[PDB]
Amino acid sequence: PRYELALILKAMQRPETAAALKRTLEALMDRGAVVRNLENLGERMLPYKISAHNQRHSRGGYFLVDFYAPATTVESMMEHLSRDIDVIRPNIVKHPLTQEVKECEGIVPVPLEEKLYSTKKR
Amino acid sequence: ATPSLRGRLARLGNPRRPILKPNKPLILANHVGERRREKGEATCITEMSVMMACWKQNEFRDEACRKEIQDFFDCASRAEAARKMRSIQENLGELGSLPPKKLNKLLHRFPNKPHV
Amino acid sequence: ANHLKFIARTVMVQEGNVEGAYRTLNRILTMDGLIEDIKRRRYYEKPCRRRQRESYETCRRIYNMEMARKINFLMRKNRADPWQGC
Amino acid sequence: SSFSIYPPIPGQENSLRWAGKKFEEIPIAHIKASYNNTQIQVVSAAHQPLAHASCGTEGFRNAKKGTGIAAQTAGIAAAAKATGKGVTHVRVVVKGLGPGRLSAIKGLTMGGLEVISITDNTPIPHXGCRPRKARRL
RNA sequence: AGAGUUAAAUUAUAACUAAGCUGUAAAAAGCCCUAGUUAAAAUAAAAUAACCCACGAAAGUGACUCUAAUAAUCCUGACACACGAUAGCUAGGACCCAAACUGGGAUUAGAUACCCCACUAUGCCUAGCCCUAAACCCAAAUAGUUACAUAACAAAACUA
Ligand SMILES: [K+]
Ligand SMILES: [Mg+2]
Ligand SMILES: [Mg+2]
Ligand SMILES: [Mg+2]
Ligand SMILES: [Mg+2]
Ligand SMILES: [Mg+2]
Ligand SMILES: [Mg+2]
Ligand SMILES: [Mg+2]
Ligand SMILES: [Mg+2]
Ligand SMILES: [Mg+2]
Ligand SMILES: [Mg+2]
Ligand SMILES: [Mg+2]
Ligand SMILES: [Mg+2]
Ligand SMILES: [Mg+2]
Ligand SMILES: [Mg+2]
Ligand SMILES: [Mg+2]
Ligand SMILES: [Mg+2]
Ligand SMILES: [Mg+2]
Ligand SMILES: [Mg+2]
Ligand SMILES: [Mg+2]
Ligand SMILES: [Mg+2]
Ligand SMILES: [Mg+2]
Ligand SMILES: [Mg+2]
Ligand SMILES: [Mg+2]
Ligand SMILES: [Mg+2]
Ligand SMILES: [Mg+2]
Ligand SMILES: [Mg+2]
């Protein structure tokens, strides 16, 4: 995967939630993106009230979409999701699996530094 | 753990710009500073206020304020006792940490060596 | 403003005393440094003063935590001297 | 006797009822302790004000109203007016840092009012309005 | 350098209660179109992490996301080319809040100062100019040595 879409949806019933995902994925495919899979994080109470499209939301559903897309089409996807009203907060980040966990050896102890002053009689 | 002192001070062989600019050199002295006396605060306030309530409610006569008057005297004696005994005992009580005089002698036996 | 109320920076009294609960709250703020932060936000300090304050706070924290280690390290050498009048 | 400092979360169901009502149903006592004045207001669970008191309204005037004793008297007066309307327990919210924080807390205690929870809601900007300049006294 | 985004605080604004509210070592002036609580845009500024010391040539940069991206197969070099905090100027837009100047209060022998209250330029965005700082780590760049050797003080001394 290359890009990850942290998608938060307004809490609603099963039919409209499926419809919202169906058209959101359709918008991604129109911009030239090959979506890998869709991950569902369930519905949870939002950490804080989020104001979007003249509404106050306290509960929402979380969904995650990962895809390969050209670099120039990220703005179009972000702009398209902003106009949509069934999505409360869209964010796009590079997929964390793109970077590899750098190998580590240990906590190297830093010795105290000497020779910071002259040796004259204080 | 002690904060690292690596690449902080302004030195000739230091590519990193200075991060610390101490007023006086970071050299451990052979003596510790004296304890600072605790600043005082007004005592017997929660007992004086209730005493004033009875005086204003009874035309400044202690015919019915005896309960409040005695507590005000008790607080004054209680505050007097603690104030006139804190100084002597606190010098050697040490709260588990040696008084400044003992630490000065201990440090003199194992002094710091800036020279040689 | 948007978060739930009566969750953050909240303590509950026990057995009906309130002076003890309040002191617990102050230790929470002092450890997290909010009490000093509110003191410094009453007026505005220029960024020139902010860095000069962080160069005195850090230096004190180094000297104090180093003199503290020496005291603990030399603490065992306080027993009665076995060679008095030797 | 396992006692937890953290408040009972509204989402859960904690069997800790004071005077027959739940935790969120208990009224609120807002305390704004500034550096020159202390204002105390008690409001219901529906945020409907019951009684209001401050160092200014209790006869203290000018510099005197900023002292601890003035805040202590305000706490006594506010509790008496609150107890008249029939409230036993209250959740006190402290606003700001000032010399009247301690006195107002125990002022409600000695005024015939019982507190169960203490909250500090001091306005803490996260970077916000630029405050006034320093005072070269 | 662009594009998109907002957590905590604050204000316009509405409801309710209260008669006072701000302010100081102490007061007055100001406000009463106010204060407390609940609900809440825009503008501006970026708690804790940071007891970390990273990036850039320097001045500088530490809220989040994406795009573009940090010269030289790795010496010195100007009056030439490019850049340069903050204040200031020209044109348009924004204005919570801070605030030179100015007005009021207080202090003082006087106070066109320190202290208190109000408000403007301005601090902000877009385009252009100005090219000044204790622009100071007062220590020039590149290779090195710990030998020789303490004016003083400081951040030890020296060679090409
Ligand atoms: K921030
Ligand atoms: Mg560098
Ligand atoms: Mg100096
Ligand atoms: Mg907000
Ligand atoms: Mg720009
Ligand atoms: Mg007046
Ligand atoms: Mg108001
Ligand atoms: Mg406006
Ligand atoms: Mg730094
Ligand atoms: Mg270079
Ligand atoms: Mg380079
Ligand atoms: Mg060159
Ligand atoms: Mg410039
Ligand atoms: Mg400028
Ligand atoms: Mg300008
Ligand atoms: Mg001109
Ligand atoms: Mg202009
Ligand atoms: Mg303006
Ligand atoms: Mg203003
Ligand atoms: Mg004047
Ligand atoms: Mg500089
Ligand atoms: Mg120079
Ligand atoms: Mg230089
Ligand atoms: Mg040069
Ligand atoms: Mg070079
Ligand atoms: Mg070199
Ligand atoms: Mg000499």
Features:
part of a larger assembly; 4 chains; A: 122 residues; alpha+beta; 4-stranded antiparallel β-sheet; 2 helices; 22% helix; 39% strand; elongated; D: 137 residues; alpha/beta; 5-stranded mixed β-sheet; 23% strand; globular; binds potassium ion; binds magnesium ion; RNA-binding
Describe the structure.
Chain A is built from two helices and four strands; from the N terminus they run βαββαβ. Chain A is α+β, with helices and mostly antiparallel strands and 122 residues long. Chain A has helices spanning 14-30, 74-83; strands at residues 3-10, 34-51, 56-68, 87-94. Helices cover 41% and strands 0% of the residues of chain B. With 116 residues, chain B is mostly helical. Chain B has one domain. Chain B is elongated and about 85 Å long. Chain C has helices at 19-32, 34-40, 47-73; one strand at residues 10-12. The longest helix of chain C is centred in the last third of the chain and has 27 residues, at 47-73. By secondary structure, chain D is of the alpha/beta class. Helix content of chain D is 20%, strand content 23%. Chain D has helices spanning 68-84, 101-110, and strands spanning 28-33, 38-43, 49-54, 89-95, 114-120. Chain D starts with 27 loop residues before the first strand and ends in a 17-residue tail after the last strand. Chain B binds chain D through residues 45-46, 49, and chain D through 68-69, 72-73, 106. β1 of chain C pairs antiparallel with β5 of chain D. Potassium ion is lined by residues 126-127 of chain D. Potassium ion binds at residues 126-127 of chain D. Chain D binds one RNA strand of 160 nucleotides through β1, β2 and β3. Chain D: Belongs to the universal ribosomal protein uS11 family. Chain D: This is Small ribosomal subunit protein uS11m. Chain D: Keywords: Mitochondrion, Ribonucleoprotein, Ribosomal protein, Transit peptide. Chain D: It is found in: Mitochondrion. Chain D: One of its GO terms (molecular function) is structural constituent of ribosome.
Topology (SSEs and partners):
This is part of a larger assembly, with chains A (122 residues), B (116 residues), C (86 residues) and D (137 residues).
Chain A: E1 3-10, H1 14-30, E2 34-51, E3 56-68, H2 74-83, E4 87-94
Antiparallel strand pairs in A: 1-3, 1-4, 2-3
Chain C: E1 10-12, H1 19-32, H2 34-40, H3 47-73
Chain D: E1 28-33, E2 38-43, E3 49-54, H1 68-84, E4 89-95, H2 101-110, E5 114-120
Parallel strand pairs in D: 1-4, 4-5
Antiparallel strand pairs in D: 1-2, 2-3
Helix pairs in contact in D: 1-2
Bound molecules: potassium ion (K) and magnesium ion (MG) (26 copies).
The structure holds one RNA strand of 160 nucleotides.
PDB class: ribosome
Keywords: mammalian mitochondrial ribosome, non-canonical stop codon
Entry title: 28S mammalian mitochondrial small ribosomal subunit with mtRF1 and P-site tRNA
